Amino acid sequence: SSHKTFRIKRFLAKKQKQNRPIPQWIWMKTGNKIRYNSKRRHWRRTKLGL
Amino acid sequence: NKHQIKQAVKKLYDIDVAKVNTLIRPDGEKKAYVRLAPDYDALDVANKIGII
Amino acid sequence: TKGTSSFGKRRNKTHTLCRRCGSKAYHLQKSTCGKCGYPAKRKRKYNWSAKAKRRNTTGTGRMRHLKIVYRRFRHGFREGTTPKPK
Amino acid sequence: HRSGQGAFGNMCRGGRMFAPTKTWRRWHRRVNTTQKRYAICSALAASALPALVMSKGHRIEEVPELPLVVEDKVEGYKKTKEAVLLLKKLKAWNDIKKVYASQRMRAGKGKMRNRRRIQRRGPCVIYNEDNGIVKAFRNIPGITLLN
Amino acid sequence: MKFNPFVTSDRSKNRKRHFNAPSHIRRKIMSSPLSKELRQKYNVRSMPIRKDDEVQVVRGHYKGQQIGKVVQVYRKKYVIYIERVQREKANGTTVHVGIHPSKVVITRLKLDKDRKKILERKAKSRQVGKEKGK
Amino acid sequence: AKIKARDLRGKKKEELLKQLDDLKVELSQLRVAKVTGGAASKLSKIRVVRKSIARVLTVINQTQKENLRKFYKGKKYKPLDLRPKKTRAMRRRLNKHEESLKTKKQQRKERLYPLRKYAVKA
Amino acid sequence: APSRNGMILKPHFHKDWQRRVATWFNQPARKIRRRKARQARARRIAPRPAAGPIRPIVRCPTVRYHTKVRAGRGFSLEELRVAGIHKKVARTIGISVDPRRRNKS
RNA sequence: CGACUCUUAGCGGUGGAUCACUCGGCUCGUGCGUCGAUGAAGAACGCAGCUAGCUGCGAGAAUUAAUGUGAAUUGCAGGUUGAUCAUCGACACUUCGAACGCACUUGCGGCCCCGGGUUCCUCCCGGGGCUACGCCUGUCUGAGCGUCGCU
RNA sequence: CCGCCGCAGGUGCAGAUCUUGGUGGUAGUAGCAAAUAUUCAAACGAGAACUUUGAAGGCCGAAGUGGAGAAGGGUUCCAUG
RNA sequence: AAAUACCGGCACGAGACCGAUAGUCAACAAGUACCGUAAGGGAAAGUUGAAAAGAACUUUGAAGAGAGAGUUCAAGAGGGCG
RNA sequence: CGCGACCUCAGAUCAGACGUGGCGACCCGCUGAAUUUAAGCAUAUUAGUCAGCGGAGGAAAAGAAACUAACCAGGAUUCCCUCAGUAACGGCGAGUGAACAGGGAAGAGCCCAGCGCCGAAUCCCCGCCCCGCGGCGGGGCGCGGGAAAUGUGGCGUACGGAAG
């Protein structure tokens, strides 16, 4: 809710930052294995824990 | 703290501060609105520190 | 009215994040981590879960001290000396 | 994906194999010392008679004698150039050329299990005293030294 | 055979060690033969390959007597790029073509204070082994 | 500029602090240029200045502790930073004096009956 | 269930025996390490006998065996006494000493 | 007649078997046999010019010093008196955690020394060092109509 | 990669409401039906029964389909593409 | 003390073993994603080519997509492609 | 009343140390089932086994006879081979079940209290000096402080010991 702790807000901050797509210059490295970010987490589908 | 910010900007920019107001962003980083006492203009200082 | 109707009233968290294991198994009323037993001095483990032990054993974290120990062993815990200068 | 699949039982994907292989299977077999010497005196006796040796595929139509009992200064040798030159002069070399020509690639999973190449077995040099004969002869592909 | 119990002849192990080698071992892996003039001069068989050597290509499509200067040593790829060995792409611009340093022969060295000490040390330890033999 | 450590290890205690401050200033000037989004030549100098800070700092710390642990050498009690950290159990063991101790019973025994060097004839 | 005439067997395998199977793949490495430690010692105590000290003559007890002779543990004190060796010098010049042995005969 | 359906064959699909490969396992053997209040294992949060994960690391943060080494790193930029690697003995090592001022909000104390308000002189601000339990040897301060002693 | 002579086995499938993956017929089928209701023009556009603007006709009818919170959610907020 | 034990740990060497529905649950960002209030449960997923030489340019279309050219021994190997 | 001695206790952020928690294949001490077998079942069996609790080490535990034997006697402990599916236990049913002797692997032995004699001959710690110790140690120095006769050290232990 609007009412948050410091621990929860740091926690939700890390999950926002982690939920960006991969850069396009990583798909051209010599060990080209990662195609796309398989750890994308949408608010409505998967509920983050807590 | 606001006290440490108000000492820092004064020491780092040769300035004077009316008040400091802080909020912690959803990035997990603080953003501090440092209002200056009327002896100094924000736009006069913005140029010399190098933001425009 | 024991299923889909009664799942509408689920808005009160019993487990929060423990402060040793970080796992969401710190019971709030009891005030005890139902995973690692936090207020207890000793770590909660049992031999009936060989799987649960290998998830949280010594080879699953960083080991920032215990890896320099293994490195530092191989020269008999030398200290104070340096290599010969140029 | 695993939820409600099928875990144990040999037929199932995953599941342990039927009668899982143990490490207390009887690997070794012991033989009577009399039989072991009966077998070695019959392995030596067949080496003498050149119909049996030629039927093994050893190319020895130029060896002057089947026993090829060489001098005792064979054991004093110290170079593979002496060891090949000796086999040239005794005319056993065309057996080593047959082993060279046999040097081929194996067929199957043996290749990824550190047995990549195969070849033929050559002349079996029996010596008395080792004064560099093993060092001289071991680099020739096919020779087995024995005591 | 190899008689040392502390050296491995396992296929997978030697393959992993070759592909996970650090740069200073990839240097040595990527040595090239010296040309016959340079061998009779220096008494050295091979040298680790360097940025500004002049070199002949021996095997593959780009072989011949053409002495090209090296311009990149790609250790992550185990390939080297030479002056005029190139290939035209669709959009007209040219690319360099990675040759393994084994399929290549040094016709001129890039000589320093340090490379000269490697040469001397190699040529010296050569004769010490030679006089143990003869 | 490539600021080495060999040169920093022969300068005065007040000089190195000034050099750290003008480096911190220099970084604080580059990090504004990073956010204005200008000059890619000055996004490459963020690593160079940060490592030049780390070099002049580790030179300060190393000269300070080599000075303290020399002054504290000829003394029984020294702080726990400067005491030897081998493993915990290895600190709990007895000294090379307390090993070499042997009771007056033994000292007389191995005076009277030492172990002889002998050989049997066959 | 028994088929015909055949021996009536009682295999001792009703416990969890598979957990406590002791396999002898150690053996040729156990023999090598013993032979290693043996030669190491034999070189360590350099001119002294490799077997160690001299063991005395001893009759096997129990009528089944008393027609034989073994090596005993160590020389009785009343054998050292009448041989004229001190019990604390004997062990230092390579003579095994047993303080428990009586001399009936 | 044709459509429709059936069978076979050619080519094209759908699907990913077979075959060949293997920086991974499984098993057996050998040498060693080392954590932690001098803060462990484990957690959390952070750190790159462009960086989500993996990996590495700790506000000196994909690494500093040192040694060995000898010209790279490389997806794209950018700029031999030692680039880069490995080694690692010097320095460093945020917040939880046995977890240590008291509580787990990072909330509120105390005790001494510094520096801002000022050129110690009080409240306010910032920095530093102490402030857990149990126990051992000694030390200081005591308690007792416990046992005595002397006026 | 295979023949011959020996050697060893986790050695031969149609079935087990067998395991895992894959595809059929049914089948362009059942269906896309709770709570009154949509319409004319214009704009942007390659493209409009559904967007947006206007005009009309309607519904919720202040115990609301309206304005604000608590718990829960965690960037869903806002702009531009 | 020595001789004995050792599926944990650091390091090695090997195999008549398995060869991606097998062999560890894990050959890959695997104790990962995901599920459960929690204890706990727990996957799938290897291969272009020798070398990206990964298809400039013309042309139809709003575009996905095509048609010609072009590289290669080969696209009857076209980016999840032996 | 008062003042020192002693004993029995408190309190300290007093001086200086030490313990806690982790891992847990192997090792030591406790606690300790039921599946199952007996063609049912209750004693038995599974089994002093799984789960639970504590404590360690590079190994641990054991160990120098209050032993085995009945011999022409053996001589600490541990491990292997055999003794041996044996002597023995058992609704004497199902089942369970060692030891001595013998051959080796290894081999190693010792110390207190007590009894007694040596002027407590003994030990810990502070303060100053010198060498010099990343295992805090040796020397000099002190009418410096304490421990200790409610017994420290030397001699000495069942194989005998001590004095003359």
TrEMBL record, chain A:
Biological processes annotated in GO: translation
Q: Which UniProt keywords apply?
A: Ribonucleoprotein, Ribosomal protein
Q: Could you cite one Gene Ontology molecular function of this protein?
A: structural constituent of ribosome
Can you tell which superkingdom this protein's organism belongs to? Eukaryota
Question: Pfam families, per this entry?
Answer: Ribosomal_L39
Query: Under the cellular component aspect of Gene Ontology, which terms does the record hold?
Result: cytosolic large ribosomal subunit
Q: Which InterPro entries match?
A: Ribosomal_eL39, Ribosomal_eL39_CS, Ribosomal_eL39_dom_sf
The subunit structure is:
Component of the large ribosomal subunit. Interacts with IMPACT.
Q: What family does this belong to?
A: Belongs to the eukaryotic ribosomal protein eL39 family.
| Function noted in UniProt | RNA-binding component of the large ribosomal subunit. The ribosome is a large ribonucleoprotein complex responsible for the synthesis of proteins in the cell.
Name of the protein: Large ribosomal subunit protein eL39
Source organism (scientific name): Oryctolagus cuniculus (Rabbit)
